[PDB]
């Protein structure tokens, strides 16, 4: 059960400067020591996961397997919930361990088993006849898991699709490190309305979770919430998914 909706022609991934973004706290006593960080004025590769053109059909799919190189900086700017979670691992195959952050409506379930992925991850939604609400059961992403080693559950990382101010834009940020066999994640939710561009001003990201997965990480891919486009009379679709990806360096 897998589909090839991610076909496209080569697309030049744009770039933009990053103004003092992604700075986070290494200790536990001060807020508001060399480590990996994103240098000021660095280049961040801007993407378009789902894009339209010409007839304005959402034909331009993409979710390439970026290289997890010395950590990653991640961020999105939108007013929706299309981007759910991430896949991390060495080879994304049914022969070595891997990680899954499968965010869903009320919880975030971090899982690490021997997943057998397809050529692309989906995590879509559809409708269930017997009850009268949509369902998000998505065995599509990983097909099966032979032998597992870890599990987890907690309140979801991402804030709700709050939509409190329509004249604003939600700028979610993240930072992922696998330093010394410990998986570390930060976060920060920030209100912005001015422009799509990453804004001036410090953010001071803060810790979220730390788990002892003990895995090697080289390839990471992002997941989206593609809802079944029940044909009014293809297959799946969504609206305007985008994000940013910089890289860390041992610099300091």
């Amino acid at each position: 059960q897998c589909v090839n909706l991610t076909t496209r022609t080569q697309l030049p991934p744009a770039y933009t400067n990053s103004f003092t973004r992604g700075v986070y706290y290494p200790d536990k006593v001060f807020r508001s020591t060399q480590d990996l960080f994103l240098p000021f004025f660095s280049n961040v590769t801007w993407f378009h996961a789902i894009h339209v053109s010409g007839t304005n059909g959402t034909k331009r799919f993409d979710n390439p397997v970026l290289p997890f190189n010395d950590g990653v900086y991640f961020a999105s700017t939108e007013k929706s919930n299309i981007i759910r979670g991430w896949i991390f691992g060495t080879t994304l195959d049914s022969k070595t361990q891997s990680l899954l952050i499968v965010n869903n409506a009320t919880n975030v379930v971090i899982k690490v088993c021997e997943f057998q992925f397809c050529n692309d991850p989906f995590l879509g939604v559809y409708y269930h006849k017997n009850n009268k609400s949509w369902m998000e059961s998505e065995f599509r992403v990983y097909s099966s898991a032979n032998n597992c080693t870890f599990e987890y559950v907690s309140q979801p990382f991402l804030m709700d699709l709050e939509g409190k101010q329509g004249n604003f834009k939600n700028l979610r940020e993240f930072v992922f490190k696998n330093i010394d066999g410990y998986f570390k994640i930060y976060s920060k939710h920030t209100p912005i309305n001015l422009v799509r561009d990453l804004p001036q001003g410090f953010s001071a990201l803060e810790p979220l979770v730390d788990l002892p997965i003990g895995i090697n990480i080289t390839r990471f891919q992002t997941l989206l919430a593609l809802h079944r486009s029940y044909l009014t009379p293809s297959g799946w679709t969504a609206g305007a998914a985008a994000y940013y990806v910089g890289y860390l360096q041992p610099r300091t």
Epitope: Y126, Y127, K129, N130, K132, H227, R228, Y230, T232, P233
Partner: antibody, heavy 127, light 113 residues
């Protein structure tokens, strides 16, 4: 989109029930409602019953109350309908019927689509 | 109760000219949504019927173009700007709203000259 296959050409003797299936390829059986219809030879069709998408139930026509049981099993995706007490003279063609809901996830309205795609049909053979 | 009957007994026609047919009921078909729901069917010999229309003012995809109907009132009609030989078969009109969902009476269509 969707492909529906059925077979009911099993040659048997009068005095028992009959089972009819509808293999659904494409939309999962939990996504598309189903209905049923009968058309005797030299006679027009006739609506019997089907799923009520807004009521979550399957309601028969008054003519067929208590005569036939219709169920489905998403593990096999074969919508079953066992029509009881058939004989040779009652052999005829039986068809499937399917449809779903129209609006997207943040929907704006329900839909009574009725039926739009049909199976190949099959003569329920009794003799 | 809601019935569905078409005025003509049979509809023998000739190649190339337009055609029309009427369907009549005992009650209205407007839905509680405000929008009325109506459909039309076409059947070729030895084949299951195909839905040609699924609302008073639409037609189904895949079916030939120029297939149209009178999308208003309660005596809706099925009309085409042309007719062909392979279209030989029968036709029906169906309702949606009335959940008893009775099946109307069709009308034979034939090629004559």
């Amino acid at each position: 989109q969707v492909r529906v296959v059925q077979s009911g050409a099993e040659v048997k003797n009068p005095g028992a029930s009959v089972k009819v299936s509808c293999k659904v390829s494409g939309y999962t059986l939990t996504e598309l409602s189903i209905h049923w219809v009968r058309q005797a030879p030299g006679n027009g069709l006739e609506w019997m019953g089907g799923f009520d998408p807004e009521d979550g139930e399957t309601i028969y026509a008054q003519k067929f109350q208590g005569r036939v049981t219709m169920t489905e099993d998403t593990s096999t995706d074969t919508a079953y309908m066992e029509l009881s007490s058939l004989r040779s003279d009652d052999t005829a063609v039986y068809y499937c019927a399917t449809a779903g809901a129209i609006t997207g996830t943040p929907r704006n309205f329900y839909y009574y689509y009725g039926m739009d795609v049909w199976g190949q049909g099959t003569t329920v053979t009794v003799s | 109760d809601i019935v569905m009957t078409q005025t003509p007994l049979s509809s023998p026609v000739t190649l190339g000219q337009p055609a029309s047919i009427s369907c009549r009921s005992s009650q209205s078909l407007v839905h509680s949504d405000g929008n009325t729901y109506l459909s039309w069917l076409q059947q070729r010999p030895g084949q299951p019927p195909r839905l040609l229309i699924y609302k008073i003012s639409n037609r189904f995809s895949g079916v030939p173009d120029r297939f149209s109907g009178s999308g208003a009132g309660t005596d809706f009609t099925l009309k085409i700007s042309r007719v062909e030989a392979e279209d030989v078969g029968v036709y029906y009109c169906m309702q949606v709203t009335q959940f008893p969902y009775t099946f109307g009476q069709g009308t034979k269509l034939e090629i004559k000259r």
